[PDB]
Design a binder for this molecule. Structure first.
Ligand SMILES: *CC(=O)N1CCN(c2ccc(Cl)c(Cl)c2)[C@H](C(=O)NCc2cccs2)C1
Length: 301
């Protein structure tokens, strides 16, 4: 029993974190086999923060301009290339701590763990979600660029996020490990703003199913709804639309508990209307939306 925001064990990722320095700029890099991945704006200068020409800046660098330190060890860079917004640095040494890994691009609503790092050293691990507006609500200070987000399923680390920047609202933007941004953001310091954010409805429903599984029933009601009528209500609360994929995806938790998906949607409609009147659900007085249907199945059963 019990229900916690649970991150993945971070040890496989810790063994991959290094420090990358170009010029006066230092940030974190990800050392997998003989390649170090890091945000390409490490090669920017103060003057070049608004409209960097990364192709121009990179053609002017030689390998010896890049200082890579794994612990006390300086790694020798033997090549450099750019892939979208990520720099790939070839090193003379393959990382002996390289886990089984893959790079994955995730979709909004997906969760992952973040290993926040500074100067190549881990500071902490926490659980995050890709918001519908393609930002993440992280905990990042300056120098944390290059920290990565990941899931571990079996013994394989799936890297899905690299941190590049903080926007003016204090939310964070980054890329997948192929260097493509999530969302419409760019690695420039020009004015950028996140779209309006919404609540991840399928994750809320998944968490209410987890609550029923942990014996919490006070928010259930005798009603059901249509998918269409529910979405008309939810949009009015800045909840995301619920699709039939979402309904299919909750199928298992619906089976496990006896409550149809559209019955639980009726309970969510009512909670949006009344709030919790002092009560809590699985320990929260707000509706939690950073647990996926998949997370709920692995922590409860
Ligand atoms: C994450 C980190 O370690 N930071 C280093 C500086 N930085 C950036 C440098 C260059 C560029 Cl092109 C970008 Cl987008 C970010 C990070 C950051 O969030 N900069 C602050 C910004 C000011 C205006 C827009 S982003 C922090």
């Amino acid at each position: 029993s019990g229900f916690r925001k649970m991150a993945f064990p971070s040890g496989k990722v810790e063994g991959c974190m290094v420090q990358v320095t170009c010029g006066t700029t230092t940030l974190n890099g990800l050392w997998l086999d003989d390649v170090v991945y890091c945000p390409r704006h490490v090669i920017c200068t103060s003057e070049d923060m608004l409209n960097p020409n990364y192709e121009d800046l990179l053609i002017r660098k030689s390998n010896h301009n890049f200082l890579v330190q794994a612990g006390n060890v300086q790694l020798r860079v033997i090549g450099h290339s750019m892939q979208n917004c990520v720099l790939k640095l070839k090193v003379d040494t393959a990382n002996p701590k390289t886990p089984k890994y893959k790079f994955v691009r995730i979709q909004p609503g997906q969760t992952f763990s973040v290993l926040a790092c500074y100067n190549g050293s881990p500071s902490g691990v926490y659980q995050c979600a890709m918001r519908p507006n393609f930002t993440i609500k992280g905990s990042f200070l300056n120098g944390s660029c290059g920290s990565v987000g990941f899931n571990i399923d079996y013994d394989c680390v799936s890297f899905c996020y690299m941190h590049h920047m903080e926007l003016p609202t204090g939310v964070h933007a980054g890329t997948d490990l192929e260097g493509n941004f999530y969302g419409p953001f760019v690695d420039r310091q020009t004015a950028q703003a996140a779209g309006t954010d919404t609540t991840i409805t399928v994750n809320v429903l998944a968490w209410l199913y987890a609550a029923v599984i942990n014996g919490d029933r006070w928010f259930l009601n005798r009603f059901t709804t249509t998918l269409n009528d529910f979405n008309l209500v939810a949009m009015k609360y800045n909840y995301e639309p619920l699709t039939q994929d979402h309904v299919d995806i909750l199928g298992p938790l619906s089976a496990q508990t006896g409550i149809a998906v559209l019955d639980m949607c009726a309970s969510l409609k009512e909670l949006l209307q009344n709030g919790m009147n002092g009560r809590t659900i699985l320990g929260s007085a707000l509706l939690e939306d950073e647990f996926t249907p998949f997370d709920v199945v692995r922590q409860c059963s």
